[PDB]
């Protein structure tokens, strides 16, 4: 339904945007009031990212302290983090080399570490430390505005780790933030019911302001960057990581998953294709049932390889749409926030847009340009879910070869 | 006791204010140090409105999710909201037409909706978005200071609704905020024990600074606006709402409540007159015992019709005392905050002053002028409680006629 | 271990600081990057003082509501507060008269009370009210930056008192903040494992910038102020307070504790010397076993007389190192924050440095000068623990004479 009511928001936002621009004449003021229902959506999204980051980081890290089954549980979590970090790095490199959207460096890397450890937890919810080399030179910090996403991710990772080790003493803190993450995931679902009304007026506000045909050549080159990144990650990278640790011809392993990949296109949900990819791994690729019963359940909500690469591409595409280049201190902030968005969205396909707003707010990019991401998101969301279950599929074969001593011992 | 120790604070603040002004000569500096124990009270009141709004909204809305008994529970809650909204609108119209205290408009209505959905939850506790049309014109927001009461009311209404539907999963969040609202209601009682000392020095600071006899003609016209509003609401409005839905001569229904209205004057508590207005509805007006056992218990702490009208009049009277006119974007902010002050004070007659500070802080009005409200509050508090139980009395007759099919089915 | 790895941080910070200054030449920029691992430690310390103050005040005050055993429980708590307030006053007077580190007043005392009751709880976490007499004069407040430690101590004392009286209703709030104080005490232990790396680069940053031999004459006069204060408090004050209430020759009582004082030097922990000072009070000074089983357990984590005097001296020594004099409104802020640091560190010897940062942040002093406190802290920490157990030892003799009717009644 939500795909059908977002495609309807884009089509009726384009039809409104061309029957208003060609049949009327608005000033700079009426074009601001026309895009007002989308401005309300853009601050309903920013409203919810502060309890979403806090609750999902504390609960997701404290859940991983309880889900790790010794060495099989640790090798699957380690594998999910490297492939996500490789898909983000592949997404960063591809969008910087191609550059769709176009036409000191040591004080930016030290501002990265100063923002991971803020001087106050309450100011981290709305302010960021920025430093400035000036005057044989001095260095001055300012504490500019915008939510410090790195300071809240690092604190809630350390806080969520501590409560997991406390056990009985901290069970009221685990239970508090579990109910807090279930509550804000239901508010995110309320905002996503308003979202087709907001995307309609915010797409139509963009169609009024264009005079060129160059914004659509940039959106076509943005889709050809995500689809290039999803093709390099699924054919060149993820078969190679299989072949480094399992010398067993990774393309025969991928053809054995062919029934699970095609149903990842029709349903377009990585968690709703679980009972097909469970049997399609064991009946065909002869993987152990003990590894499959852990890797595929925790992997369908943690291993998001296609989503991480797409968010990395889309945030730098917005930062090239608005004429910036981000340096390097903002590129690492993309690469941490897009990687930690696996935990920061607690296994929900609804939160694909709001994790986009977390990545854009971690740098300071305009969140109103996310409608150009949403207007072509329905085309690419099918192919992200195919890569999200392929990294889960290749994880059952990789963790099994690494844990061959745990399968002669568990019997 | 608390009425006797507030009337003593006003009389000993007037006696101090005329033995200091006529027998001494203070500068602008000693008149500021003289009103210092009242300045401490004015920031002890503002200190507590942030955990009071948050905890009472989350618990009051999550309680209404559990108290609604199908259609009888929904018709009583719907009736309590319309009469409160009518008494506020009647209070706004009367204080604007009479004007006691005297002698763009589209960017103010859109600032109302921008403040209902703030961009950050932590900045909503101390900052408000204001917009500015400038330059063929542009529009700039600024995020000025002062607590965003609408953003916290709307979020905690949506948050309190979500936890009520979660049930077992969110029971730790219901239990957390229940204990948080019981804790801050005990801190409000501690501040109200300091309040006679603070009102003494803050009344006496006003008596020093007057040179006219015009501030008392404005306070007399303020009491003649509340008492006019309580007379129109109890004779013209609330009998008419009975006659629209129950064609049964509403003044005979009101004479049947005459024993409950007179004991609402002596005790001056709408919750402490319950066991008299229970029997006086059934023994006289022949109302069903099944409707009375729900409408009157939840109505004595929710249906506050005389309090809502009085707060609406008093906040615009302060906004006419200090020379303003509020436009229309601040008048709707009165009409939401005074209406939601039924839930925002969890059934306590102590919190009549602090809900006044919530309404004055929702706009940005000076909270130090609440002593002119307090100095005549003991005269009018008797008549507010009579209207607060008359809307409860008329609610048993209205909900019974609307729910005639639920009384042939429940047997 | 932690003493051995901090003495190693000071020695290797002095050896680095003299092989860099004499063998190289840095600009103003490379001297800032050299002290960068210590700058990260200085904002990891400030990060944790906000959940440490809040959780330890709410839990420590709500624990004292449950630990008081009538009159024996009240006399021990009252005795712990006066001796701590006397040792702070003795520390303030000695550092002002000697002045190691060298070479309106009514608007500062009213700013003290305005900051105890802030206008907002969220702004109290990062802002402080300061007032300004200007223009026959007016008075203007500004709300400058820096965390309001007095507003959070006073609120969490009133909040922690209310939850203790609520009992069953507020048991979820006691259980929430107990787990929150156990969680942030484990994060403080993580920061103290980074602390030898941070102190190394922050000591070495000071050795580069000196050209004189005058900073070491000030550090020697700072140790001769703490050791003078610990000698006056343990020989002149605490024997006198014994002799006022117990006419039993206080030096014979102190010689009876000689086995407990010497093991307070070797172990250097006031809580780890409990099973020696239990028997050494009863076997020698013939104190009752009913008073000893309460006074010494709650006193080893509350009665910190040597720590309170040392923090009072060290904060004014930093405020004389950086050329200030603090007036009197900042001296009372030292005397409240150093006194309440008994509750604000929940019985942990790790938190001696972070309570130093709380006292320096309560005024607004530079926290980077705490390395001169740390570099000589290992010399003085042995003698603070001897005074911390001597006030506990003298407390068993004082509370017993005050409670002679409770020991003829309890049998």
Q: What is the 3-state secondary structure (H, E, C) of B298-321?
A: HHCCCCCHHHHHHHHHHHHHHHHH
d(CA A5, CA B280): 55
Cβ pair B14, B188 in contact under 8 A: no
Long-range contact pairs involving C261-265 (C-beta distance under 8 Å, separation at least 24): C261/C386, C261/C389, C261/C390, C264/C385, C264/C386, C264/C388, C264/C389, C265/C382, C265/C383, C265/C385, C265/C386
B:C CB pairs within 8 Å:
76
| Residue in B closest to A45 by C-alpha | B119
d(CA A118, CA C43): 6
User: DSSP class of residue B270?
Assistant: S
* Chains interfacing with A (3 or more CB pairs < 8 Å): B, C
**Among C31, C302, C40, CA closest to C197:** C40
SS (H, E, C) B17-84: HHHHHCCCCCCCCHHHHHCHHHHHHHHHHHHHHHHHHHHHHHHHHHHHHHHCCCCHHHHHHHHHHHHH
**Among B315, B303, B306, CA closest to B357:** B315
Q: How far is B206 from chain C (nearest CA, A)?
A: 17
Neighbours of B98 (CB within 10 A): 18
Looking from the CA of B346 toward its CB, the CA atoms found within 13 Å total: 27
Question: Would the CB atoms of C183 and A162 count as touching at under 8 Å?
Answer: yes
Question: Would the CB atoms of C137 and B28 count as touching at under 8 Å?
Answer: yes
d(CA C307, CA C340): 11
d(CA A178, CA A55): 7
Residue A402: C-alpha distances to residues A71, A76, A133 (Å):
9, 10, 49
Question: Would the CB atoms of C166 and B186 count as touching at under 8 Å?
Answer: yes
Cβ pair C387, C230 in contact under 8 A: yes
d(CA C244, CA C103): 41
d(CA C142, CA A142): 19
Question: Would the CB atoms of C169 and B179 count as touching at under 8 Å?
Answer: yes
Residue B254, class by beta-carbon neighbours within 10 Å (0-12 exposed, 13-18 middle, 19+ buried)?
buried
Residue B5: C-alpha distances to residues B10, B38, B196, B201, B349 (Å):
9, 16, 6, 14, 15
**Among A232, A238, A235, A381, CA closest to A314:** A381
Residue A282: C-alpha distances to residues A244, A256, A393, C174, C297 (Å):
22, 10, 11, 50, 61
Cβ pair B68, B228 in contact under 8 A: no
Residues 6+ apart with CB under 8 A from B358: B49, B52, B53, B149, B337, B341, B344
Residue C221, class by beta-carbon neighbours within 10 Å (0-12 exposed, 13-18 middle, 19+ buried)?
middle
Residue A300: C-alpha distances to residues A29, A230, A387, A392 (Å):
46, 17, 11, 7
SS (H, E, C) B144-190: EECCCHHHHHHHHHHHHHHHHHHHHHHHHHHHHHHHHHHHHHHHHHH
Between the two ends of chain B, the Cα-to-Cα distance in Å is 46
**Among B152, B178, B181, CA closest to B348:** B181
Cβ pair B149, B361 in contact under 8 A: yes
Is C121 at the interface with chain B, CB within 8 A? yes
Cβ pair C53, C152 in contact under 8 A: yes
CATH of the domain spanning C1-406, picked from 3.40.50.1820, 3.40.50.300, 1.20.120.640, 1.10.3860.10 = 1.10.3860.10
Residues 6+ apart with CB under 8 A from C348: C185, C188
Residues 6+ apart with CB under 8 A from C76: C294, C295, C298, C299, C395, C399
Cβ pair C340, C175 in contact under 8 A: no
| Residue in B closest to A148 by C-alpha | B120
Among B30, B35, B43, the residue to mutate for chain C (most C Cβ within 10 A): B43
List chain B residues with CB under 8 Å of A43.
114, 117-119
Choose among C27, C32, C126: nearest Cβ to A120: C126
Strand C127-128 relative to strand B144-145, pairing: unpaired
d(CA C205, CA B235): 80
**Among B66, B394, B336, B13, CA closest to B198:** B13
d(CA B304, CA A86): 61
Given resolution (angstroms): 2.8
List chain A residues with CB under 8 Å of C28.
136-138
Backbone angles phi, psi at C212, to 5 degrees: -110, 180
A:C CB pairs within 8 Å:
75
Is B118 at the interface with chain C, CB within 8 A? no
d(CA C373, CA C195): 14
CA A313 to chain centre: 10
d(CA B219, CA C172): 46
* Chains interfacing with B (3 or more CB pairs < 8 Å): A, C
Cβ pair C125, C152 in contact under 8 A: yes
Residue A34 is inside which H or E element, if any? helix A30-34
Q: Which of residues 32-51 of A touch B (CB under 8 A)?
A: 32-33, 36, 39-40, 43-44, 46-47, 50-51
Cβ pair B254, B281 in contact under 8 A: no
Neighbours of A247 (CB within 10 A): 9
Q: Considering just the CA atoms, what is the radius of gyration of chain C in Å?
A: 22
List chain C residues with CB under 8 Å of A136.
27-29
The reply to whether B307 sits in an annotated binding site is: yes
Neighbours of A272 (CB within 10 A): 14
**Among C155, C105, C97, CA closest to C125:** C155
Backbone angles phi, psi at B139, to 5 degrees: -140, 125
SS (H, E, C) chain C: CCCHHHHHHHHHHHHHHHHHHCCCCCCCCHHHHHCHHHHHHHHHHHHHHHHHHHHHHHHHHHHHHHHCCCCHHHHHHHHHHHHHHHHHHHHHHHHHHHCCCCCCCHHHHHHHHHHHCCCCCCHHHCEECCEEEECCCEEEECCEECCCHHHHHHHHHHHHHHHHHHHHHHHHHHHHHHHHHHHHHHHHHHHHHHHHHHHHHHHHHHHHHCCCCCHHHHHHHHHHHHHHHHHHHHHHHHHHHHHHHCCCCHHHHHHCCHHHHHHHHHCCCCCCCHHHHHHHHHHHHCCCHHHHHHHHHHHCCCCCHHHHHHHHHHHHHHHHHCCCCCCCHHHHHHHHHCCCHHHHCCCCHHHHCHHHHHHHHHHCCCHHHHHHHHCCHHHHHHHHHHHHHHHHHHHHHHHHHHCCCCCCCCC
Cβ pair A282, A274 in contact under 8 A: no
Is C119 at the interface with chain B, CB within 8 A? yes
| Residue in C closest to A123 by C-alpha | C126
Looking from the CA of A167 toward its CB, the CA atoms found within 13 Å total: 1
Between the two ends of chain A, the Cα-to-Cα distance in Å is 46
Residues 6+ apart with CB under 8 A from A66: A164
d(CA A376, CA A353): 12
**Among A139, A138, A144, A106, CA closest to A126:** A144
Q: How far is A169 from chain C (nearest CA, A)?
A: 6
The length of chain C is 411
Region for residue A249 given its phi and psi (left: phi exceeds 0; alpha: psi -120 to 50; beta: otherwise): left
Residue A396 is inside which H or E element, if any? helix A377-402
Neighbours of B366 (CB within 10 A): 12
Q: Considering just the CA atoms, what is the radius of gyration of chain B in Å?
A: 22
List chain B residues with CB under 8 Å of A51.
121
Cβ pair A144, A106 in contact under 8 A: no
List chain C residues with CB under 8 Å of B33.
106, 110
| Residue in C closest to B38 by C-alpha | C114
Residues 6+ apart with CB under 8 A from A173: A58, A163, A166, C176, C179, C180, C183
d(CA B246, CA B242): 5
CA C229 to chain centre: 15
Q: Sign of dihedral through CA atoms A27, A28, A30, A35?
A: positive
Choose among A33, A46, A175: nearest Cβ to B119: A46
Question: Would the CB atoms of B47 and C120 count as touching at under 8 Å?
Answer: yes
* Chains interfacing with C (3 or more CB pairs < 8 Å): A, B
Is A232 at the interface with chain B, CB within 8 A? no
Neighbours of B7 (CB within 10 A): 15
Q: How far is A384 from chain B (nearest CA, A)?
A: 29
Residue A369: C-alpha distances to residues A314, A318, A357, A372, B216 (Å):
10, 7, 10, 6, 57
**Among B96, B141, B106, CA closest to B335:** B96
Q: Which of residues 313-342 of A touch B (CB under 8 A)?
A: none
Q: How far is C114 from chain B (nearest CA, A)?
A: 7
Strand partners, A134: A138
List chain A residues with CB under 8 Å of C367.
none
Is A190 at the interface with chain B, CB within 8 A? yes
- Give me the residue spans of the domains in chain C: 1-406
Cβ pair A118, A151 in contact under 8 A: yes
How would you label C62-91 residue by residue, b for 16+ Cβ within 10 Å and e otherwise? bbbeeebeeebbebbbebbeebbbbbbbbb
List chain B residues with CB under 8 Å of C138.
28-29, 32
Is C177 at the interface with chain B, CB within 8 A? no
Cβ pair B287, B396 in contact under 8 A: yes
Residue A399, class by beta-carbon neighbours within 10 Å (0-12 exposed, 13-18 middle, 19+ buried)?
buried
Choose among A114, A117, A173: nearest Cβ to C179: A173
Is A136 at the interface with chain C, CB within 8 A? yes
Cβ pair A402, A75 in contact under 8 A: yes
E strands along A23-168, which residues?
Answer: 127-128, 131-134, 138-141, 144-145
d(CA C91, CA C83): 12
Looking from the CA of A114 toward its CB, the CA atoms found within 13 Å total: 21
**Among B306, B309, B317, B312, CA closest to B369:** B317
- What residue spans of A100-170 are helical by DSSP H? 106-116, 149-166
**Among B331, C46, B383, CA closest to A143:** C46
């Amino acid at each position: 339904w939500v795909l059908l009511s977002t495609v309807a928001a884009v089509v009726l936002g384009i039809t409104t945007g061309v029957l208003v621009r060609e049949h009327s004449n608005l000033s700079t003021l009426e074009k601001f009031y026309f895009a007002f229902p989308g401005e309300i959506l853009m601050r309903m999204l920013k409203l919810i990212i502060l309890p979403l980051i806090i609750s999902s980081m504390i609960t997701g890290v404290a859940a991983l302290d309880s889900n790790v089954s010794g060495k099989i549980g640790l090798r699957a979590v380690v594998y999910y983090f490297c492939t996500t970090l490789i898909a983000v790095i592949l997404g960063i490199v591809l969008v910087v080399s191609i550059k769709p959207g176009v036409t000191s460096t040591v004080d930016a890397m030290l501002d990265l570490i100063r923002n991971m450890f803020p001087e106050n937890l309450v100011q981290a919810c709305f302010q960021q430390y920025k430093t400035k080399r000036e005057e044989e030179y001095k260095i001055v910090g300012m504490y500019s505005d915008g939510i410090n996403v790195l300071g809240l991710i690092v604190f809630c990772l350390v806080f969520g780790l501590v409560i997991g080790k406390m056990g009985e003493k901290g069970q009221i803190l685990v239970d508090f933030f579990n109910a807090l993450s279930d509550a804000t995931m239901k508010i995110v679902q309320i905002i996503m019911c308003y979202m087709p009304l907001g995307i309609l007026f915010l797409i139509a506000g963009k169609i009024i302001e264009v005079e060129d045909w160059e914004i659509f050549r940039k959106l076509g080159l943005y889709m050809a960057t995500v689809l290039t990144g999803l093709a390099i990650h699924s054919i060149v990278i993820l078969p190679l990581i299989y072949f480094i640790v399992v010398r067993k011809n990774p393309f025969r392993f991928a053809m054995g998953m062919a029934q699970a990949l095609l149903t990842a296109l029709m349903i377009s949900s990585s968690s709703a294709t679980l009972p097909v990819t469970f049997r399609c791994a064991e009946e065909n690729n002869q993987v152990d049932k003990r590894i499959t019963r852990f890797v595929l359940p925790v992997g369908a909500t943690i291993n998001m390889d296609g989503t991480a690469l797409y968010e990395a591409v889309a945030a730098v595409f917005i930062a090239q749409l608005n004429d910036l280049d981000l340096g390097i201190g903002q590129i690492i902030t993309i690469s941490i926030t897009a990687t930690s968005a696996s935990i920061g969205a607690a296994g929900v396909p609804q939160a694909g847009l709001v994790t986009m707003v977390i990545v854009l707010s971690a740098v300071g990019l305009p969140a109103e340009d996310v409608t150009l991401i949403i207007a072509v998101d329905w085309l690419l969301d099918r192919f992200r879910t195919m890569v999200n279950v392929l990294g889960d599929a290749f994880g059952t074969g990789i963790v099994e070869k690494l844990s061959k001593k745990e399968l002669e011992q568990m019997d």
